[PDB]
């Protein structure tokens, strides 16, 4: 008979009296004798590998004063991997019956992350707290993703036309074109049609947050312009109303050419009025903010010859 040592993950050294003819089952039953651990929960590691139950200490060439390493594993448990956006991978021991609630508690125990801040995603779908891993068909060595609720850091808020308020994570160096791209990443709105407004000031891309002195927890307003086919109304003094097809990039010269095609009036005899102003031929419809379903008034110069 000989003595060997078993070292636990808690840091305890256990001594056992064993024989070379003892199987790994026998060694696990001795550990159950002393520590009360179920033998089919025990894993014994020697020479850096796991010992199989059917073999003996002699088969693995375990001698006197050899040190075995004990790891506890649920008999019906499995390992899964939760991937963060930071690139860190957490390895959890779970059971197929474990609920998403339990998995969050396991992530808290290991990584100190509160379940408040835990959103788990498997195969593109966010997992609900009452359902189990088997419900989502999460199997051995499956891979899940963990998205944390916040970073703290610096945040700003963007309210939109749909009533949805957006939360963004930026740094004072951030170009407004950058913040427009981060809005584009979360909402899909192309940056060229975004107008970010802080305190009534239109923000221009070149300047950054610190240069507009916009600190954290600010709330901005996102107004959207659009380049696309629109319809405007040109109204004569007689009440005659024609409907035009235009783009915001169209010139006033372009509009007068369209009126000439539809009503035969030459542009040199055309004077267009919008928002109490006469429209200059050089400027565009965007320049006057002439948007959809606007009414332009048409006054003709006096004929003579």
Using rule CB under 8 A, residue 83 touches other proteins: yes
* Minimal distance, residue 238 CB to other proteins, in Å: 5
Q: Does 291 bind other proteins (CB under 8 A)?
A: yes
Q: Which of 16, 105, 189, 242 binds other proteins (CB under 8 A)?
A: 189
**Location of structure tokens 């594993």:** 73
Nearer to other proteins, 56 or 270 (CB): 270
CB of 115 to other proteins, least distance (A): 19
Burial 67-77 (b: 16+ CB within 10 A, else e): ebebeeeeeeb
Q: Which of 1, 13, 48, 112 binds other proteins (CB under 8 A)?
A: 48
Interaction residues for other proteins, span 222-281 (CB under 8 A)? 222-224, 226, 235-238, 271, 273-278
Q: Which of 34, 64, 227, 301 binds other proteins (CB under 8 A)?
A: 301
In the complex, what is the shortest distance from the CB of residue 1 to other proteins, in angstroms, rounded to a whole number? 25
First to last CA, the chain: 131
Please tell me whether residue 16 binds other proteins under the rule CB under 8 A: no
Interface residue with other proteins among 14, 37, 90, 242 (CB under 8 A) is 90
Chosen residue from 186, 227, 262, 283 binding other proteins by CB under 8 A: 186
Q: From edge to edge, which strands make up the β-sheet containing 143-148?
A: 89-94, 78-84, 143-148, 118-122, 125-126
Q: How far is the CB of 133 from other proteins (least distance, A)?
A: 14
Select the residue interacting with other proteins from 50, 137, 173, 215 (CB under 8 A): 50
- Of 1, 49, 261, 264, the one binding other proteins (CB under 8 A) is 49
Candidate ranges 22-30, 57-65, 78-86, 248-256; the one touching other proteins (CB under 8 A): 78-86
Question: Residue 1 or residue 13: which is nearer to other proteins going by CB?
Answer: 13
Selected binder of other proteins within 107, 144, 168, 203 (CB under 8 A):
144
């Amino acid at each position: 008979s000989m003595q060997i040592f078993v070292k636990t993950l808690t840091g305890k050294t256990i001594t056992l009296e064993v024989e070379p003819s003892d199987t790994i089952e026998n060694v696990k039953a001795k550990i159950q004798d002393k520590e009360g651990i179920p033998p089919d929960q025990q894993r014994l590691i020697f020479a850096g590998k796991q010992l199989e139950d059917g073999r003996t200490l002699s088969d693995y060439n375990i001698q006197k004063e050899s040190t075995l390493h004990l790891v506890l594993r649920l008999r019906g448990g499995m390992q899964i991997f939760v991937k963060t956006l930071t690139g860190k991978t957490i390895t959890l021991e779970v059971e197929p019956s474990d609920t998403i609630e339990n998995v969050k508690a396991k992530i808290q125990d290991k990584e100190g992350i509160p379940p408040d801040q835990q959103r788990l995603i498997f195969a593109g779908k966010q997992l609900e707290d009452g359902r189990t891993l088997s419900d989502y068909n999460i199997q051995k060595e499956s891979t899940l993703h963990l998205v944390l609720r916040l970073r703290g850091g610096m945040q700003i808020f963007v309210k939109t036309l749909t009533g949805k308020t957006i939360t963004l994570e930026v740094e004072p160096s951030d170009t407004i074109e950058n913040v427009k791209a981060k809005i584009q990443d979360k909402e899909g709105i192309p940056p060229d049609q975004q107008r970010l407004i802080f305190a009534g000031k239109q923000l221009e891309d070149g300047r950054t947050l610190s240069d507009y002195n916009i600190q954290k927890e600010s709330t901005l307003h996102l107004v959207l312009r659009l380049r696309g086919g629109m319809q405007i109304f040109v109204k004569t003094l007689t009440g005659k109303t024609i409907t035009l097809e235009v783009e915001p990039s169209d010139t006033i010269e372009n509009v007068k050419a369209k009126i000439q095609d539809k009503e035969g009036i030459p542009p040199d005899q055309q004077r267009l009025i919008f928002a109490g102003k006469q429209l200059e031929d050089g400027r565009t419809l965007s320049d006057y903010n002439i948007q959809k379903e606007s009414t332009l008034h048409l006054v003709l110069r006096l004929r003579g010859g």
